[PDB]
């Protein structure tokens, strides 16, 4: 068991969780711009690719905060020890997207090897879920490289007890001397508030500004 | 009775109200940036705090327009003579937010005294609604001070006949020579359209640019 | 018959369509900024008005891509040969909006004549749908000229099998040496993905940068 059953009996956010879960079911999206000036430099002195490093960096930050790793399993509220990213891959020949995942690793070079192999194996597989069933301990990551956006938001009919963060990136752009990346974060309010989203974004920004390895 | 029953029989927006209320239930959110350069200067020559003045200023503008003060009471469509703001307060020890309100006043200094006392009284109260039942004649105001956003949007499951405006502020930032504040406005389309939201924002901007007292 | 019944039996996006249509009903909105510097120049050397040219230009691009012209008719998935725009008109005396449409034409001057006459005929008609029943082969276009927005999003209760794109424009603004127009695109995920929205926006931008006639 790769999760811990959360002591909700005793949880300080108990009232908050039930209000936003059942009283006023709510989630929100917010788009913010990440300075990736430093990151671009780091990439430049390396052989790492952009999409693969963002995946890694987002999964790395989601994995430092518990509230971004919450779920319901057995009608119980759990916390995943770790999450693996499910990212999108564009298929040029069909104009559709496939969703892929691979195991997260604190070792970036091991991450990269995991990524390239999943990519090699399923590159021509235009099914929606080429690997089958999505692992429950996941996060969704996606990228719209062709257009810059100031906003993005998913309008989903029903969102009951779906607590995995959905992260979307747009095309970066030169905003003077800075290179910025619009990143949309969408979460459920039962487990995550505005503070927790801000704390993830401040952490991701830190990481973009640090050495890769 | 602190409201007037609206003559809907005769209302020019009658068809519009029923279409967006029952035919195609709809609301929208929009985020715009308020120049608060002047405001910062005003604050600087004063002892007023930021969050408290924004609250006051938003409640002041919501209180000049009727359509932002609408509601259903008794299955009747009403207009509130006045509304009191319900703002959020962050509790650092629990990572949760409390919602508080206090009486609106055209006298800012009286507003401030109302604010500080409600704050003093409930500062350590991490309940969600420390004061109990929210007053019906309200508006929601909230602030995400830790992160700058270009967009924000609430995804609420059901929104039936909930006509109170929800306003969210982000961290301001220096956009050249200007200090700007992302402000998200979310409303129901039955009572408020794009014109009315724009008219509120143009009015709030005016007010940010004027003397406080 | 102004549509073709789509071979969905054989469609490469078959799985994608049913997943986002029934499994996880989903749509999204995204706001991007269109450089209309060139366009302003073109207008300047002409007698064309802004709202009318944007309408024309958006309808022109929607009409080059099939996926933006999809619908359900007879429980069948169709593609419209062509679509006519339904745009909004502000009535200053009532503070409400009317929705109007007129026939699309590859000849801009013919477009303009169609537009001016529909405008002349229904200018003082504050009904919501002054012309009656909206043509099925449409797109919605709207404009909020009074305020600049970085984001916009419609929160619609139910969106079942409604595949027509909704496009919203804000007030442009001078962003240094460029004049930019925030444009919000909202679509259903069953027929349109992030690639297809980006491809529409890249096409509209091209068109803004080209001669009118
Ligand atoms: Co419950
Ligand atoms: Co860990
Ligand atoms: Co009705
Ligand atoms: Co009054
Ligand atoms: Co089905
Ligand atoms: Co054609």
Min Cα separation C38/chain A (Å): 19
Min Cα separation A16/chain B (Å): 7
Question: Residue A72 and residue A18: Cα distance in Å, rounded?
Answer: 13
Question: Residue B183 and residue B205: Cα distance in Å, rounded?
Answer: 11
With an 8 Å Cβ cutoff, are A28 and B155 in contact? Answer: yes
Cβ-contact A153, B151 below 8 angstroms: yes
In the A/B pair of chains, how many CB contacts fall below 8 A?
87
Question: Residue B148 and residue B181: Cα distance in Å, rounded?
Answer: 8
DSSP states of C149-198: -SEEEEEES--TT----EEEE---EEETTEEEEEEEEEEETTT--HHHHH
Count Cβ neighbours within 10 Å for each residue of A46-57 and write b for 16 or more, e otherwise. eebebbbbbbbb
Count Cβ neighbours within 10 Å for each residue of C200-211 and write b for 16 or more, e otherwise. bbebbbebbeee
Question: Residue C94 and residue B13: Cα distance in Å, rounded?
Answer: 7
Nearest by Cα to A127 from C15, B92, C113: C15
Select from A95, A142, A153 the Cβ nearest to the Cβ of C29.
A153
With an 8 Å Cβ cutoff, are B194 and C97 in contact? Answer: yes
Cβ-contact C138, C84 below 8 angstroms: yes
Cβ-contact C72, C163 below 8 angstroms: yes
The β-bridge partners of B156 are A26
Question: Residue A120 and residue C165: Cα distance in Å, rounded?
Answer: 36
- Work out the widest C-alpha separation in chain C, in whole angstroms: 53
Q: Quote the ligand 1 centre to B90 CA distance (angstroms).
A: 24
In terms of residues, how long is chain A?
213
Best C30, C90, C147, C180 residue to mutate vs chain B (most B CBs within 10 Å): C147
In the 3-class helix/strand/coil scheme, how is chain B assigned residue by residue?
A: CCEEECCCCCCCCHHHHHHHHHHCCEEEEEEEEEECHHHHHHHHCCCCCHHHHHHHHHHHHHCCCHHHCEEEECCEEEEECCCEEEEEEEECCCCEEEEEECCCCCCHHHHHHHHHHHHHHHCCCCCCCCCCCCCCCEEEEEECCCCCCCEEEEEECCCCCCCCCEEEECCCEEECCEEEEEEEEEEECCCCCHHHHHHHHHHHHHHHCCCCC
If you compute the radius of gyration of chain A from its CA atoms, what whole number of angstroms results? 17
Question: Residue A206 and residue A65: Cα distance in Å, rounded?
Answer: 15
CA distances from B168 to A72, B150, C148, C151 (A): 29, 12, 17, 13
Q: Give the three-state DSSP class for C47.
A: coil
Element (H, E) at A174: strand A173-175
Best C195, C200, C203 residue to mutate vs chain A (most A CBs within 10 Å): C195
If you compute the radius of gyration of chain C from its CA atoms, what whole number of angstroms results? 17
Cβ-contact C32, A150 below 8 angstroms: yes
Question: Residues lining ligand 5 (ion), CB within 5 A?
Answer: C 18, 22
Bridge-based pairing state of the strands C178-188 and C26-35: antiparallel
From the list C138, C188, C189, C196, the catalytic residue is C189
Question: Residues lining ligand 1 (ion), CB within 5 A?
Answer: A 18, 22
Name the residue in chain A with its Cα closest to that of C191.
Answer: A96
Q: C186: which chain A residues are within 8 Å (Cβ-Cβ)?
A: 155
Question: Residue C140 and residue C134: Cα distance in Å, rounded?
Answer: 11
Question: Residue A103 and residue A83: Cα distance in Å, rounded?
Answer: 8
Q: Quote the ligand 6 centre to C192 CA distance (angstroms).
A: 18
A touches which chains (3+ CB pairs under 8 A)? B, C
Q: What is the set of domains in chain A, with CATH numbers?
A: 1-213 (3.30.559.10)
Phi (first) and psi of residue A49, to 5 degrees: -100, 155
Min Cα separation B92/chain A (Å): 10
Nearest by Cα to A102 from A65, A139, A67, A70: A139
What residues of chain B have any CB closer than 8 angstroms to a CB in chain C?
Answer: 12-13, 15-16, 19, 24-33, 150-156, 158-159, 182, 184, 186, 193-199, 201-202
Q: Give the three-state DSSP class for A34.
A: strand
Nearest by Cα to B163 from B4, B25, B52: B25
Query: Which experimental technique did the depositors report for determining this structure?
Result: X-ray
Q: A31: which chain C residues are within 8 Å (Cβ-Cβ)?
A: 151
Neighbours of A25 (CB within 10 A): 19
Question: Residue A102 and residue C10: Cα distance in Å, rounded?
Answer: 31
From the list A138, A188, A189, A196, the catalytic residue is A189
């Amino acid at each position: 068991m790769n999760y811990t059953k959360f002591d909700v009996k005793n949880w300080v956010r108990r009232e908050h969780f039930e209000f936003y879960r059942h009283r006023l079911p709510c989630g929100f999206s917010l788009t913010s711009k990440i300075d990736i000036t430093t990151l671009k430099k780091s990439l430049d002195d390396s052989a790492y690719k952009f999409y693969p490093v963002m995946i890694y960096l987002i999964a790395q930050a989601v994995n430092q905060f518990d509230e971004l790793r919450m779920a319901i399993k057995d009608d119980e509220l759990i916390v995943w020890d770790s999450v693996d990213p499910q990212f999108t891959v564009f298929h040029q020949e069909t104009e559709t997207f496939s969703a892929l995942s691979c195991p997260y690793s604190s070792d970036i070079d091991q991450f990269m090897v995991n990524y390239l192999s999943v990519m090699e194996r399923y590159k021509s597989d235009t099914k929606l879920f080429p690997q089958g069933v999505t692992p429950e301990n996941h996060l969704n990551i996606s990228a719209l490289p062709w257009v810059n956006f100031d906003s993005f938001n998913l309008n989903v009919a029903n969102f009951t007890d779906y607590f995995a963060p959905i992260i979307t990136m747009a095309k970066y752009q030169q905003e003077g001397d800075r290179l910025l990346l619009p990143l949309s974060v969408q979460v459920h309010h039962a487990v995550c508030n505005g503070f927790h989203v801000a704390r993830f974004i401040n952490r991701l920004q830190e990481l973009c500004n640090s050495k890769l390895k």
